[PDB]
Design a protein around this nucleic acid. Structure first.
Ligand SMILES: [Mg+2]
Ligand SMILES: [Mg+2]
Ligand SMILES: [Mg+2]
Ligand SMILES: [Mg+2]
Ligand SMILES: [Mg+2]
Ligand SMILES: [Mg+2]
Ligand SMILES: [Mg+2]
Ligand SMILES: [Mg+2]
Ligand SMILES: [Mg+2]
Ligand SMILES: [Mg+2]
Ligand SMILES: [Mg+2]
Ligand SMILES: [Mg+2]
Ligand SMILES: [Mg+2]
Ligand SMILES: [Mg+2]
Ligand SMILES: [Mg+2]
Ligand SMILES: [Mg+2]
Ligand SMILES: [Mg+2]
Lengths: 82, 98, 134, 59, 187
RNA sequence: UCCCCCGUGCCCAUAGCGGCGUGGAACCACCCGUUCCCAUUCCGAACACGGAAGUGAAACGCGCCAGCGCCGAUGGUACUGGGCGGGCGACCGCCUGGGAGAGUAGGUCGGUGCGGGGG
RNA sequence: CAUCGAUCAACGGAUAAAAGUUACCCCGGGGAUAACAGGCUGAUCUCCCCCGAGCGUCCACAGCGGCGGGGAGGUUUGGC
RNA sequence: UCGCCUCCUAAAAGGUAACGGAGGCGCCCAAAGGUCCCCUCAGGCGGGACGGAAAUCCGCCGGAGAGCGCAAGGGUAGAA
RNA sequence: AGAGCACUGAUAGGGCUAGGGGGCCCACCAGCCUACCAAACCCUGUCAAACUCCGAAGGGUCCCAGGUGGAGCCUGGGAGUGAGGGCGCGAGCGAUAACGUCCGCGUCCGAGCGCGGGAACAACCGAGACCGCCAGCUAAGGCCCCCAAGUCUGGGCUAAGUGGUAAAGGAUGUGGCGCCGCGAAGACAGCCAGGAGGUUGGCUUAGAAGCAGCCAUCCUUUAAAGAGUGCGUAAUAGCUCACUGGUCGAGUGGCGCCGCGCCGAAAAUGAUCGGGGCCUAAGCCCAGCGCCGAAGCUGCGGGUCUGGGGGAUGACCCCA
């Protein structure tokens, strides 16, 4: 019954929690993060912004919204105000 | 082609988009958000002479006169495809000096 | 071919899209129930048609084995079967037009498809044509 | 507008978790239990959610 | 060719789908009416009517409309139709298909060959007034290796095309024999 | 309030591609010269200055076509919540909600806000 | 306070410093786990058949059944 | 094989196992770092002394199919 | 999921065409045809976990509203658990085997081996058991006997014990449907009469007269015969095939589909749906009323817990 041993295909990597964090119409505070992502899939809009890892974080307190610039991408903004 | 239209749109508002043609030079002060123009300084649309460089230097002094009575102070330049050199400097260099 | 190695399976779900209609041909063969038709009954069904009529006709195979088989050899459990020891198979669901031919009447072709229809694990129904072209 | 009266003739055994928790929201604990409420469409959902367990009458 | 038809409305499709009826719909440029028709009546007629013959509908509104099929949503699996689209003709131009009745026996068939009527029908540009029946082709001087495109065609009066004259229509292919299995399983 | 031109912003191909006509009064571009600011990994090609010999050919904006491209219903279907049924088997069927994809008729050679100049 | 000495790679790292044999063996437990069988399957095995290209002096079927296809048994080799 | 990275299995929030299917890392860059400015590919067609299917050039077509150090994925010429 | 080919790759046919294969220009080194292999591109029709121009039901999150549930939150004391298993589904592995395994959702056993149907049968079906009662309603499932309840009513189906376990396949089993041919000028089956010359068609062989193979896809006298549907032949001759006539006398044939059946189908102690036994319905399809049924619900009684309520109260009294 004694057979062979082994291949090469069991390696994997561990999870990165890739997602939109806060969603549209969610109250967010200051500094919060909104989009953890790979690249510029959703782009930083009004009162948003990103460093290094494409991380959309609110510059200022407000409400989060989505608008679709079809061509120009997808944009997450911040409605400060109230 | 344009970039710096976007570069300013990051920071504040108050686009001062300058158009330069071979005999003409038009300089507005246009605000986004509301997406509406304001001080529409020009020369070939005003009445000034035609020596180009030393003509931009005066339309540059117009917005100052015209705007400082409208609640304006905040510079926010908008070089077009041009390169901050000749007429665009003279157009500019009178602005804050005005 | 060129492809790349081996592939999972795929539960033949809805007896559907794997389906067609007699295009470039007179009469054709249909599937009453699904299976995994192999690159060895096809040829076996193919040559069985030609041999019925020497010098004649044109047989239009319309399925292709683009799928890997996988079998291990008597061992235990490790890795995935390299397999292919029978080769390649073609995903076949009902309604599909397996074969269809042209070049003779029917008394010389109601059997050529009747024959090869016996080279299949699945029940078949010869298609006349029915000009229902879409 | 008339109310909503619902009776139950089936048991929540062999049926999922949320399906049960609705019956708590509607207040169904026993057998042939009669909870009569106000035909509000938010509530109708959980009746539409367990339509097979409960019997519905219009009052 | 005459053909009774009926109306379906707020009912449900699969209903008289069972009882032997058949659902459909008609449309032009300013009307869309869900309707239904008998199947065995549709199956009696369409087999030779096809996507070509004159199609008339004599609805219980007394109306009698010259129309055409243009989509057959057959039941994939179970060789039977399920739904039909109807185009309301009028007078304005229209694209449609015309049979390509080939005539004679070709030359390549003699020394081994079979006709492969690639397109028996051609999308054309024409008027409902002018309803051609077929476009004959003297396919005969064609041998094992001689094809025929949309270029090689004599068109009836008042009819023009919308496909491409750089397309294909028919061909005579070599046959298949048993002496050539050597070129196959053993190589 | 409207029409043309110029700068520009939004809706993101019912704006795009190709072809066809028009526009030069002002508009803008081509165009003259590189003396000075500036500049080309050679070059006034481009960036730039000075400017009126020439023109709307280019490029550009405006109107027509529908060939490509795009948009695209209704209808019906696959599929699927959820409840249920049949076959040991691969799988299939019923009911109530949801409802595609592609294919059809059809539509499309953009729409709009601000300022400035000229009507 | 700033910084250095890591295949501590068995990479949350027992020590700073570590390989084997036992059938001369023993102990504590495990069918949570292998051989013999009981059980599931039935890939292979044995038997059986369906079409029918051809053999059989002429002719598919007296007897034979290419390429294929579907089954019964659970006697083999195996899998669980 | 043991740590870490990319895709699927991952059943459309995250996450998900198997001695499942496929591939990488233990480096590197004083410029591959930041600021300001200029420029925008691969490929194809057709002409071009070398070479020659493929050398630098030129006209057209060319919206991303090139490039972004290394595996893969996301992203991206309205630049990175 | 689905579907599609616009990216990644895969593919059958045809087409036009870079390259090469046969053949001439037989060589300046190029060229034309091509039942040849072949990419670029197009149409026809497609394949995909690591393809997506699209795209769901569902899924997650914030707001609003219902929702008082042993909801949710916070602080602290204490534990236990961290081997699980079954079934339905979506995948991977495995042989589209395994009462095999690794995952996800949900369910249940474990902790419900406590009850009722499934003959028996932990997780299949119903249904959460606080106790008592010789009370009533029911779910699953059942109604000839063990075995409580219609040998119930109407309408079909099958002659095998199908029911009471299995295929590809064969068929002249049976019933229902639809699509047509024939026929009073006379049709299906039977019976009588005739059934031929050109022609031993051309190639083919020892031979090919129809019966070896290949090929096309003739002319006739006659009311009617086809380069012949089988046998038979070595080739032949012989019969019979359809076809014409008469006979004749109340009808006939062919295609496919479904509803139910037949065979296929051979194992080891003794055999059987649980057993008997069954318009032989006590089996299958449909419709209707009725009945039995579990600890589920209801009825009365008792206990205990949480909460409210009565008392200027221990206790007791009420209701959920
Ligand atoms: Mg991120
Ligand atoms: Mg319908
Ligand atoms: Mg005027
Ligand atoms: Mg450690
Ligand atoms: Mg010793
Ligand atoms: Mg062993
Ligand atoms: Mg047979
Ligand atoms: Mg055999
Ligand atoms: Mg950089
Ligand atoms: Mg790059
Ligand atoms: Mg799929
Ligand atoms: Mg609330
Ligand atoms: Mg029991
Ligand atoms: Mg109770
Ligand atoms: Mg009794
Ligand atoms: Mg036996
Ligand atoms: Mg025994």
């Amino acid at each position: 019954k004694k057979g062979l041993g082994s291949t090469r295909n069991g390696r994997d990597s561990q999870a990165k929690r890739l997602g939109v964090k806060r969603y549209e119409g969610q109250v967010v505070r200051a500094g919060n993060i909104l989009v953890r992502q790979r690249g510029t899939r959703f782009k930083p809009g009004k009162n948003v912004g990103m460093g290094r890892d494409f991380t959309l974080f609110a510059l200022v307190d407000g409400v989060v919204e989505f608008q679709d610039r079809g061509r120009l991408g997808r944009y997450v903004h911040v409605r400060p105000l109230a | 082609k344009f970039r710096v239209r976007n570069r300013i749109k990051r920071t504040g508002r108050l686009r001062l988009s300058v158009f330069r043609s071979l005999k003409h030079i038009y300089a507005q002060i246009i605000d986004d958000e509301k997406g509406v123009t304001l001080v529409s300084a020009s020369s070939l649309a005003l009445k000034l002479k035609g020596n180009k460089t030393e003509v931009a230097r005066q339309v540059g002094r117009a917005l100052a006169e015209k705007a400082l009575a409208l609640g304006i102070k905040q510079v926010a330049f908008d070089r077009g495809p041009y390169k901050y050199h000749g007429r665009v400097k003279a157009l500019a260099e009178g602005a804050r000096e005005g | 071919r060129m492809k790349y190695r081996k592939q999972q399976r795929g539960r033949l779900k809805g007896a559907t899209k794997g389906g067609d209609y007699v295009a470039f041909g007179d009469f054709g063969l249909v599937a009453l129930e699904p299976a995994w038709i192999t690159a060895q009954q096809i040829e076996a069904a193919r040559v069985a048609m030609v041999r019925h009529f020497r010098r004649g006709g044109k047989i239009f195979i319309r399925i292709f084995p683009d799928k890997p088989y996988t079998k291990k050899p008597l061992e235990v459990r490790m890795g995935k079967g390299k397999g292919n020891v029978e080769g390649y198979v073609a995903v076949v669901k009902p309604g599909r037009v397996m074969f269809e031919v042209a070049g003779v009447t029917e008394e010389q072709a109601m059997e050529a498809l009747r024959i090869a229809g016996h080279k299949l694990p699945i029940k078949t129904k010869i298609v006349r044509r029915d000009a229902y072209d879409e | 507008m008339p109310r909503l009266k619902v009776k139950l003739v089936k048991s929540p055994i062999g049926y999922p978790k949320d399906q049960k928790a609705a019956l708590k929201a509607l207040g169904l604990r026993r057998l042939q239990q009669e909870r009569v409420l106000e035909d509000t469409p938010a509530i109708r959902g959980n009746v539409e959610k367990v339509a097979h367990l409960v019997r519905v009458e219009v009052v | 060719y005459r053909l009774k038809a009926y109306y379906r409305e707020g009912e449900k499709p699969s209903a008289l789908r069972r009882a032997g009826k058949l659902p459909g719909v008609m449309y032009n440029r300013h009307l869309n009416r869900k309707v239904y028709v008998d199947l065995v009546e549709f199956d009696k007629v369409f087999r030779q009517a096809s996507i070509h013959h004159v199609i008339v509908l004599e609805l219980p509104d007394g109306q009698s409309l010259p129309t055409l099929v243009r989509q057959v949503n057959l039941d994939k699996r179970r060789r039977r139709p399920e739904h039909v689209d109807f185009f309301v003709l009028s007078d304005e131009p229209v694209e449609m298909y015309v049979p390509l009745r080939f005539v004679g026996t070709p030359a390549g068939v003699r020394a081994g060959g079979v006709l492969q009527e690639i397109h028996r029908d051609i999308l054309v540009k024409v008027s409902p007034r002018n309803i051609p029946e077929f476009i004959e082709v003297d396919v005969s001087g064609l041998e094992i290796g001689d094809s025929l495109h949309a270029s090689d065609l004599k068109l009836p009066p008042g009819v023009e095309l919308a496909v491409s004259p750089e397309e294909t229509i028919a061909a005579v292919v070599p046959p298949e024999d048993v002496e050539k299995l050597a070129e196959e399983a053993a190589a």
